[PDB]
Design a binder for these strands. Structure first.
Lengths: 89, 177, 59
RNA sequence: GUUAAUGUAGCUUAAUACAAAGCAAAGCACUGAAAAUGCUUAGAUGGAUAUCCCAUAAACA
């Protein structure tokens, strides 16, 4: 018996507001799908200019649900934002 | 009983839907205020322009999703099928699913099997046989040998009905987009 | 910077864009339900022929 | 075709009366997230009696 793990999506965008707007937008999209989001953590600045990364916690996926979800997420991606999918520690 | 396994491969849409011009100009406006209120060779956009007929090539479409569809030959049958391979009960569906990824396609496609539960099963009889349709999501696909001797076609659902007539093969749309 | 007329024009279509998304989500949610129900339907189909094979699948 | 499902809007036997209702869901604003809150968005009798029914989709086929 196995189920989809809890995978954090790190929304990395140079502009904080753009990431926040997508973070609010993507989370609201998750509300449509009823996807549980435990937390939205903020990473420190990517000091070298700096960039801002925002975690969108995602818990619980299904085989058919997962395939549609990623497709919706891609289309939602407004501009110059890089998506990421990584298993939580 | 003869056991035959198949995989319903899913190709992600690489390119997002284009934003409206008002969104772009609105994006410019929010971009400017964001700085004020800030708190602390690439591949071609569409690689289909040159081909126009390479259904075999994985990159038949980039804006939309695709599903691999491979002509298959059996001992007594030769019909257009979803990617299919012969499997044994000892191997689990994911293990059989993995074999389909390399056996039929022999490519370095990037696939992860997160859900072991299958999405499609249909029985075809003339000898009792059944087809297993697995489900998986692709982050990206690197399909080697685009021009194979096989008639593999990447089409999500548009060509599924055209090539797969019977309900045992035309109902694959039920779990597809 | 958008003009006040532009905001009014955008405001009208933003409602349509919200409406377009809202209709899509209802279909999308129902589509998942059919797909999930179809996935359950696929689960039942092979169970009749051979339940032992699912023993590996359910893992 | 035989069995069988299944047809007010995600849900409801809310309703056929004085309303096609209530609930779920939705945009934006409000910036930990969520929830709350303000301002806003879209809808059904696919169908009859006063059970068949055509459509749909299954085991038989």
């Amino acid at each position: 018996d196995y189920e989809y793990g809890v995978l954090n999506i790190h929304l990395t965008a140079y502009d904080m507001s753009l990431a926040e707007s997508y973070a609010q937008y993507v989370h609201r999209l998750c509300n449509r799908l009823s996807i549980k989001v435990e937390e939205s953590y903020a990473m420190p600045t990517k000091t070298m200019l700096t960039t801002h990364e925002r975690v969108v916690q995602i818990s619980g996926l299904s085989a058919t649900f997962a395939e549609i979800f990623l497709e919706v997420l891609q289309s939602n991606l407004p501009e110059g934002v890089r998506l990421s999918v990584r298993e939580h520690t | 009983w003869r056991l035959s396994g198949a995989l319903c491969l899913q190709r992600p849409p690489l390119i997002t839907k284009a934003l409206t011009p008002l969104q772009e100009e609105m994006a410019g406006l929010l971009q400017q205020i964001e700085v004020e209120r800030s708190l602390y060779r690439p591949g071609a956009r569409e690689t289909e322009a040159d081909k126009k007929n390479d259904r075999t090539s994985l990159h038949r479409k980039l804006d939309r999703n695709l599903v691999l569809l491979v002509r298959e030959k059996l001992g007594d049958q030769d019909v257009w099928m979803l990617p299919q391979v012969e499997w044994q009960p000892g191997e689990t569906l994911r293990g059989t699913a993995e074999r389909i990824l390399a056996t039929l396609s022999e490519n370095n496609m990037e696939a992860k099997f997160l859900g072991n539960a299958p999405c499609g099963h249909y029985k075809f009889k003339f000898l009792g046989v059944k087809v297993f349709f697995f489900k998986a999501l692709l982050l990206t696909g690197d399909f080697v040998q685009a021009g194979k001797k096989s008639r593999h076609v990447w089409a999500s659902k548009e060509e599924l009905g055209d090539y797969l007539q019977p309900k045992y093969l035309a109902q694959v749309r039920r779990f597809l987009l | 910077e958008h003009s006040p007329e532009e905001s009014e024009r955008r405001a009208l279509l933003l409602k349509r864009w919200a409406l377009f998304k809202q209709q899509e989500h209802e279909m999308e949610r129902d589509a998942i339900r059919s797909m999930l129900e179809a996935q359950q339907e696929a689960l039942e189909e092979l169970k009749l022929e051979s339940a032992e094979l699912y023993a590996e699948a359910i893992k």
